[PDB]
């Protein structure tokens with residue numbers, strides 16, 4: 001009856017709710033209209049949800065995803081229309097609203113996302129009131145795996161952390177200098193590439209230089225994004241993968257810059273299903 | 278009868294030298310194999326110079342251009358071979374060697390490029406011995422117009438330099454945030470876009486925040502790139518447009534980083550032309 005989604009830049013999880021229960025859970029690759037034309041978006045969409053759904057018809061469909069700026073929301077909604085059957089109108093918004101509906105539900109509060117990309121907001125109870133548009137992983141997205149990987153590759157190959165870690169990194173993923181620039185500048189979804197090579201940071205987090213890179217990235221995010229809200233009486237609900245597995249470094253950078261924190265979960269799906277019933 | 282060129286990712290100049298003089302000069306847009314396949318680069322080459330190029334059949338031909346790393350040198354080298362007719366063997370290199378031959382000729386010294394992109398090297402007298410390969414404007418290129426433009430836009434729309442400069446920037450180039458993000462993530466040659474909006478820094482240099490942003494970008498460049506060379510007895514020949522019109526901030530950052538300075542040219546061609554005959 002209802003279909004729920006949350007499209008990250010690298011992956012997408014889909015949920016099917018009927019009479020308030022979960023009758024199906026789906027995974028797909030990431031969809032961002034700034035990395036995917038509607039053909040790629042849609043032909044992928046053909047290959048995705050439809051095969052694992054006995055019935056392709058619904059009454060309500062709610063799709064939240066990265067790159068879903070208002071200028072691109074109708075584009076993505078028409079992509080989903082040419083593949084689904086819903087009795088009412090399709091809602092299409094950003095992943096921030098999914099995170100907010102998941103964390104706070106019908107109540108207000110601050111919500112931030114740290115995964116493939118980064119983002120920060122204040123939320124009313126039914127809609128996002130304010131938002132720092134993150135500009136992406138080239139002009140912002142500070143503190144997220146794609147940016148972490150961007151920083152790490154840059155620092156390593158500028159000989160800023162020595163040869164040992166540089167060689168362990170380039171050997172662990174069997175990459176030459178050419179692979180990076182080809183993968184980042186000429187190959188689809190370079191943010192996936194960066195966010196995927198970024199867990200090397202977690203692997204060698206005991207090194208001060210790597211721990212400091214992660215900490216200073218978290219610092220810059222909080223400074224340039226979360227500080228723009230009333231962070232002195234609001235418990236920032238953090239959602240995302242980077243924020244979950246780097247919990248300690250995030251709490252480090254938060255106590256440094258005075259940013260407050262509340263509940264920190266990795267995926268909004270279980271909080272989203274609670275909201276819809 | 279020889280032709281020498283130097284194509285930055287934004288522009289390209291071609292020269293045909295006979296009788297010790299320059300007998301003809303044509304200009305075309307920039308070609309970079311990481312934002313243009315070599316055919317597309319090439320499909321313009323038909324449109325620009327050849328229609329006017331009286332003879333495409335001459336002796337030696339030597340082409341230097343950005344993004345033209347060893348992994349990419351042969352592809353571009355055959356593209357010029359399958360239309361062009363040159364009597365001797367093909368030279369293919371990066372813009373750094375043109376800058377070095379122009380700046381240093383047959384003598385050594387440190388040579389740096391500051392325009393659309395960044396790069397760093399020490400040069401012997403026939404070829405570059407050491408180099409910090411800049412990885413481009415997404416993983417490095419610190420101190421370059423695209424990176425300067427990247428930083429300024431990022432800071433502005435995250436409200437890090439106020440509303441006055443942010444608004445003056447967005448109305449003066451008649452850009453909205455979505456247009457920005459569309460131009461950087463979906464539009465060809467985003468490095469030109471950033472480097473073209475970057476002169477806003479020089480225009481508003483009286484603001485402390487912008488002067489410090491430009492200076493600190495220059496600082497880290499010297500730090501992460503030039504410091505990797507012998508900067509204590511070598512007078513760094515800086516080459517480029519950014520380096521000429523931001524001369525004072527560069528000398529500031531040079532006294533800041535103890536780094537020495539030499540010659541500042543924006544374009545190398547007559548020094549390149551001086552080298553050949």
Ligand SMILES: CC(=O)N[C@@H]1[C@@H](O[C@H](C)C(=O)O)[C@H](O)[C@@H](CO)O[C@H]1O
Pocket residue numbers: 008009032034065066067068069094095096113116117118119133134135136137141458
């Ligand atoms: C241009 C781009 O990719 N933005 C995305 C965001 O998308 C919304 C629509 C936005 O741009 O504001 C997304 O919420 C965050 C977290 O996933 O990462 C950013 O990179």
Ligand SMILES: CC(=O)N[C@@H]1[C@@H](O[C@H](C)C(=O)O)[C@H](O)[C@@H](CO)O[C@H]1O
Pocket residue numbers: 181285286309311342343344345346371372373390393394395396410411412413414418
């Ligand atoms: C990935 C990329 O585009 N790098 C280019 C450089 O190209 C060389 C070959 C290199 O990549 O090492 C170029 O020298 C400088 C200055 O123009 O700008 C960078 O952006």
